[PDB]
From a paper:
Tweety homologs (TTYHs) are conserved transmembrane proteins present in all eukaryotes including three members (TTYH1, TTYH2, and TTYH3) in humans. Each protomer consists of five transmembrane helices (TM1–5) and an extracellular domain (ED) which extends 75 Å from the membrane surface between an extracellular N-terminus and intracellular C-terminus. We conclude TTYHs are not pore forming subunits of anion channels and their function may involve Ca2+-dependent changes in quaternary structure, interactions with hydrophobic molecules near the extracellular membrane surface, and/or association with additional protein partners.
We determined the cryo-EM structure of TTYH2 in the presence of Ca2+ to 3.3 Å resolution. The map enabled de novo modeling of 396 of 532 amino acids from each 59 kDa TTYH2 protomer chain with the majority of unmodeled residues within the unstructured C-terminal region (amino acids 415–532) and others within poorly resolved segments of the N-terminus and intracellular loops. In the presence of calcium, TTYH2 adopts a side-by-side homodimer (a “cis-dimer”) within a single nanodisc membrane. This region includes residues from EDH1 (Y109, S112, E113, and E116) and EDH4b (D384 and E387) with Y109 and S112 underneath E113, E116, D384, and E387. Based on electrostatic and geometric features of this site, we speculate that these densities correspond to coordinated Ca2+ ions that would reduce repulsion otherwise expected to occur between the electronegative surfaces of each protomer. In TTYH2 cis-dimers, we observe horseshoe-shaped density within the pocket, although the density is not sufficiently featured at this resolution to unambiguously identify and model.
Author numbering:
A (entry chain B): 5 to 73, 89 to 414
B (entry chain A): 4 to 73, 89 to 414
Write the structure that this text describes.
Amino acid sequence: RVEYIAPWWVVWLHSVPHLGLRLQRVDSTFSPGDETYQESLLFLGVLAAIGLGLNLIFLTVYLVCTCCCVTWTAVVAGLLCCAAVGVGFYGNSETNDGMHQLIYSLDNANHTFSGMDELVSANTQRMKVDLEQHLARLSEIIAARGDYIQTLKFMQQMAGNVVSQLSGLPVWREVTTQLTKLSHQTAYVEYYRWLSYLLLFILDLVICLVTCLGLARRSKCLLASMLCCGILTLILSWASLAADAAAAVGTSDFCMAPDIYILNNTGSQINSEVTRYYLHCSQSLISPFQQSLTTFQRSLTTMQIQVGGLLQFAVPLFPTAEKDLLGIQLLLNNSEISLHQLTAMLDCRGLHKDYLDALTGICYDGIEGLLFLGLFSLLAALAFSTLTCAGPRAW
Amino acid sequence: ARVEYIAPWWVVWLHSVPHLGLRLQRVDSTFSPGDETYQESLLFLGVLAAIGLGLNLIFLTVYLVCTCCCVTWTAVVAGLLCCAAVGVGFYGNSETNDGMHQLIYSLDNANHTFSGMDELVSANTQRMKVDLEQHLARLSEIIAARGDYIQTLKFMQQMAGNVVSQLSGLPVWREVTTQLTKLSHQTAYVEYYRWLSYLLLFILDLVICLVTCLGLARRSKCLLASMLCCGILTLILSWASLAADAAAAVGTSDFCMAPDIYILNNTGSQINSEVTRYYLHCSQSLISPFQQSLTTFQRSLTTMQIQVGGLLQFAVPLFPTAEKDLLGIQLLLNNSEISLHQLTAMLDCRGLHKDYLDALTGICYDGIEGLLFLGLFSLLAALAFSTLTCAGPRAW
Ligand SMILES: *[C@@H]1O[C@H](CO)[C@@H](O[C@@H]2O[C@H](CO)[C@@H](O[C@@H]3O[C@H](CO)[C@@H](O)[C@H](O)[C@@H]3O)[C@H](O)[C@H]2NC(C)=O)[C@H](O)[C@H]1NC(C)=O
Ligand SMILES: *[C@@H]1O[C@H](CO)[C@@H](O[C@@H]2O[C@H](CO)[C@@H](O[C@@H]3O[C@H](CO)[C@@H](O)[C@H](O)[C@@H]3O)[C@H](O)[C@H]2NC(C)=O)[C@H](O)[C@H]1NC(C)=O
Ligand SMILES: *[C@@H]1O[C@H](CO)[C@@H](O[C@@H]2O[C@H](CO)[C@@H](O[C@@H]3O[C@H](CO)[C@@H](O)[C@H](O)[C@@H]3O)[C@H](O)[C@H]2NC(C)=O)[C@H](O)[C@H]1NC(C)=O
Ligand SMILES: [Ca+2]
Ligand SMILES: [Ca+2]
């Protein structure tokens, strides 16, 4: 039993000042689909574009100085490109693994909720068929014995009580129907993001290797187009840095205080106390369902005792009736078994473990991958800047 | 949803590789960590690695003597191969480190659940004992002028004895927890040292290559001679790394083919075979053998409550000062009752099976991939350093 605590790379990154456009201070509270927050992240993109423009201004200054008015730099550029590619590959793998763990946890939670709902529905149907079995049995088998009719009626009322107790439990249709869509969407987005960064890595490596191989054939016509591509790769790297910074700050925002956001998001389809119980599990919050399970088991035991007593006192009288009554016993047995499974799902240990696993997949692997991808972008930008600086010196 | 473990391609293919003793003998063994024959069979991979190292060195020295006794492209190729090798090795080391952490997490979770089960059983037994002593103290307070109350107390004592026996029917998890925690500590220690050693190897390779390049830029000083000398040292280190990676991958891949069989064979005395088969395999149609216990246990509790309920409805005018501890009885039962729910949550298979499917994904999906990528490291680093050593003495 452990509780999530935000690591250093989350709290420190959350400490980064948040600004809008006109030197305005905004609230560093996660709020997707907004305007004072969604546009707040665009400041990072503005800073990235400013840095890209400044870098190209300095490169143009160098070109003007070297036009109007060596192998060590190429070696440095190649080494920096290789280091950047390695760091980027590691970061991409880590941030893909984080989302894979997220999807796994969401699938597990969806399966548990579906199992709970199916068990409740099956128990309700079982009681509904118990009703008609009682009706058929008391139709004409028991006439003179008033006590037998009385105990059949008492069993029928107990069945009604069990039905009401089962209906007392919540319904998990909305949570499942949103978890499935969130899982599908995150898988889709993760696939495209991974493919895009893989293509970027391949393109960078190919360009650098072609540069190294073709610099030996004494500056053919490919050099000009290659140098032109050296600017599109730079703008791609800067855009990657902007995207990584925005995603990292968003994840830090929805990792500093995740339970507040989760509780605020869901307050209608399921109760607030249920959510607080599932998100916070300890031997102080006992259960909101303790009374319901207790009375369900009490009614089941009363039913079983009455059925046993009826069997012990009806073997000689109406021997052909047991064919129905024994079935009831089996039915109750099944119900009893289901109850155990139910108390294994209503316990919050499994769901809290799934929530902790999803949160670890978000805040411990996605953010590290984004940070390493930002380091990749910085190193690749530096290496390509060095390559473009050393290019025209040949001609 | 719920899934069953299936061996991936990199395990089924890696398991197929021949295992031949040390003298081309059919060792035909499945898995045996403590058996000397299996260790000798695994030593065949080390023998092959040493043979490969010797062949590579003899080929390199034959080439050297032929080209001596009778170009920056080679240096560039060596540097590029070294950088690619270092990157692949870092990724593989991180990946194989990220599996021995999930292993420890799963072991700790299972240990915590077993400890909770044992503590709950012990606490319930103690609660029944204090219930018995409370009945013993109370029986002297009320008198037998009513008669039925003494019979009710006798029935409560009998039910308490039945509850105690039912609790004693449940298994004990001391040996399992001790083995689990010792294995967790050992694997943490081993993986920490492995990671530290390989990180030091990466740093050494990078430093050697960079300072060798700088010395080459320094017109072949004695430093260059020192680097050509230690090229053989780092080559044999890389070959030993390949030996270790191949041996470990061959070793912990046969376990991944049938892990449940090995686990069940390891533990068959301290706990029953049915319990282990239930926890390892609980797919669709198992009865959860504890059920027949829990059910009757629950029954007894309810009976007790009903009795004490009556004892609170027909004893209000007969010595009300005696009702105080009676309310305590109810509280006692209440506590026991809620504990029972927790118990039926821990005895459920899916609580621990998901821990068995995580300690298995941390071995069969992350350790083996890391070992394979580290073997790729060893191959690439050996090739790069062989090229560097071949191109070295050309300057002299
Ligand atoms: C997440 O939970 C949702 C339910 O909230 C799942 O969606 C649907 O779940 C039902 C219930 O099992 C599936 O019905 C099944 O259809 C098969 C078709 O052959 C039938 O054989 C079964 O007896 C059952 O009736 C339904 O197919 C499923 N919908 C989809 C699109 O799969 C969902 O599967 C759960 N998992 C995920 C990853 O969303
Ligand atoms: C696996 O579970 C077992 C049982 O829960 C753990 O063993 C218990 O661990 C606790 C703390 O780790 C021990 O408490 C300590 O006791 C010493 C005195 O012996 C005291 O000086 C400390 O301040 C602390 O209270 C407890 O004694 C120990 N029980 C036994 C029977 O060894 C075990 O630590 C768990 N494994 C892991 C890796 O956590
Ligand atoms: C052991 O558990 C039982 C039930 O789980 C406790 O009985 C419940 O105790 C509460 C609070 O002590 C009482 O609620 C009362 O309900 C009546 C209606 O029956 C209402 O008029 C009162 O204003 C009050 O809310 C009541 O005794 C009982 N309630 C229910 C629904 O069962 C018992 O108290 C527990 N033992 C101890 C020592 O607390
Ligand atoms: Ca990882
Ligand atoms: Ca990984």
